Amino acid sequence: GGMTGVLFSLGASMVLGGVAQMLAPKARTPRIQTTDNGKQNTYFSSLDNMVAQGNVLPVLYGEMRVGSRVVSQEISTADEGDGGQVVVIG
Amino acid sequence: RWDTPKVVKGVSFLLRLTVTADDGSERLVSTARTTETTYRFTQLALGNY
């Protein structure tokens, strides 16, 4: 137990994947679909309304106009009324 | 013409017209699926419907 044989140095065994990978951990590209055609969406953009069923609530960090997750949509009859008494319908 | 009731998502209006026959039965004259609240019928004949 005094000695520690089999030092087993690791050099190119970790370089073999690439050198910038051992300084920066790289990024994950999304999966490409077919019905989506060629619109390569990323993981930090959403310009359409989503559905909030058993999903997570997204967060925003700066600028970059985004869509939303619809929680309630309803149509009723538009009653006549303003912020006052002027209610002419002639 | 009518009003829009309580609604989820979106709605369309389906309207059909029936004409009472001479013996007592019914005759269907056309049908329409629309989105506008107001509809107009033109060139109608016979009596009650």
GROMACS .gro file of C-alpha atoms in nm, chain A residues 2-90:
model
   89
    2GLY     CA    1   0.299   0.228   0.036
    3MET     CA    2   0.361   0.246  -0.339
    4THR     CA    3   0.103   0.340  -0.603
    5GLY     CA    4   0.186   0.147  -0.917
    6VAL     CA    5   0.014   0.185  -1.254
    7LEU     CA    6   0.023   0.565  -1.269
    8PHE     CA    7  -0.175   0.547  -1.596
    9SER     CA    8  -0.120   0.896  -1.738
   10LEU     CA    9  -0.400   1.045  -1.948
   11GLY     CA   10  -0.279   1.270  -2.230
   12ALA     CA   11  -0.435   1.244  -2.575
   13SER     CA   12  -0.698   1.009  -2.429
   14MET     CA   13  -0.898   1.325  -2.358
   15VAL     CA   14  -0.760   1.536  -2.645
   16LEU     CA   15  -0.898   1.285  -2.896
   17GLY     CA   16  -1.238   1.455  -2.886
   18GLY     CA   17  -1.097   1.801  -2.958
   19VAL     CA   18  -0.886   2.063  -2.785
   20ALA     CA   19  -1.141   2.344  -2.751
   21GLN     CA   20  -1.367   2.093  -2.575
   22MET     CA   21  -1.131   2.080  -2.275
   23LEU     CA   22  -1.141   2.460  -2.242
   24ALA     CA   23  -1.508   2.521  -2.328
   25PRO     CA   24  -1.785   2.260  -2.279
   26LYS     CA   25  -1.945   2.318  -2.625
   27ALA     CA   26  -2.317   2.370  -2.690
   28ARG     CA   27  -2.608   2.140  -2.772
   29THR     CA   28  -2.772   2.181  -3.111
   30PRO     CA   29  -3.144   2.102  -3.138
   31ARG     CA   30  -3.286   1.806  -3.326
   32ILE     CA   31  -3.381   1.870  -3.689
   33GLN     CA   32  -3.735   1.787  -3.802
   34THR     CA   33  -3.877   1.727  -4.150
   35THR     CA   34  -4.224   1.884  -4.134
   36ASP     CA   35  -4.051   2.194  -3.994
   37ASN     CA   36  -3.868   2.217  -4.332
   38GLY     CA   37  -3.562   2.433  -4.275
   39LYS     CA   38  -3.650   2.664  -3.987
   40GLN     CA   39  -3.367   2.578  -3.745
   41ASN     CA   40  -3.518   2.685  -3.415
   42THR     CA   41  -3.286   2.716  -3.114
   43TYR     CA   42  -3.349   2.679  -2.739
   44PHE     CA   43  -3.378   3.050  -2.657
   45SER     CA   44  -3.644   3.175  -2.901
   46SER     CA   45  -4.020   3.129  -2.931
   47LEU     CA   46  -4.234   3.352  -3.154
   48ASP     CA   47  -4.558   3.155  -3.122
   49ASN     CA   48  -4.819   3.090  -2.856
   50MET     CA   49  -4.767   2.764  -2.668
   51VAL     CA   50  -4.996   2.553  -2.451
   52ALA     CA   51  -4.953   2.552  -2.073
   53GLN     CA   52  -5.058   2.195  -1.993
   54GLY     CA   53  -4.823   2.016  -1.755
   55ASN     CA   54  -4.533   2.221  -1.890
   56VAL     CA   55  -4.277   2.458  -1.737
   57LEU     CA   56  -4.308   2.834  -1.720
   58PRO     CA   57  -4.038   2.997  -1.937
   59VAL     CA   58  -3.803   3.268  -1.813
   60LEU     CA   59  -3.672   3.577  -1.992
   61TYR     CA   60  -3.338   3.751  -1.940
   62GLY     CA   61  -3.310   4.044  -2.181
   63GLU     CA   62  -3.493   4.215  -2.469
   64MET     CA   63  -3.586   3.968  -2.747
   65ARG     CA   64  -3.962   3.984  -2.801
   66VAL     CA   65  -4.117   3.643  -2.733
   67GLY     CA   66  -4.447   3.460  -2.751
   68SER     CA   67  -4.622   3.318  -2.445
   69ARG     CA   68  -4.818   3.023  -2.306
   70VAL     CA   69  -5.193   3.071  -2.339
   71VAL     CA   70  -5.382   3.016  -2.015
   72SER     CA   71  -5.735   3.138  -2.099
   73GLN     CA   72  -5.898   3.228  -2.432
   74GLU     CA   73  -6.263   3.331  -2.451
   75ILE     CA   74  -6.497   3.528  -2.678
   76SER     CA   75  -6.801   3.718  -2.552
   77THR     CA   76  -7.036   3.982  -2.687
   78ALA     CA   77  -6.873   4.325  -2.685
   79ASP     CA   78  -7.098   4.537  -2.465
   80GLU     CA   79  -7.127   4.909  -2.533
   81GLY     CA   80  -6.937   5.117  -2.279
   82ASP     CA   81  -6.650   5.362  -2.235
   83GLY     CA   82  -6.483   5.545  -1.948
   84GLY     CA   83  -6.764   5.795  -1.911
   85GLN     CA   84  -7.126   5.860  -2.001
   86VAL     CA   85  -7.094   5.931  -2.377
   87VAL     CA   86  -7.260   5.617  -2.516
   88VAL     CA   87  -7.401   5.738  -2.848
   89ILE     CA   88  -7.476   5.457  -3.093
   90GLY     CA   89  -7.638   5.673  -3.362
   0.00000   0.00000   0.00000
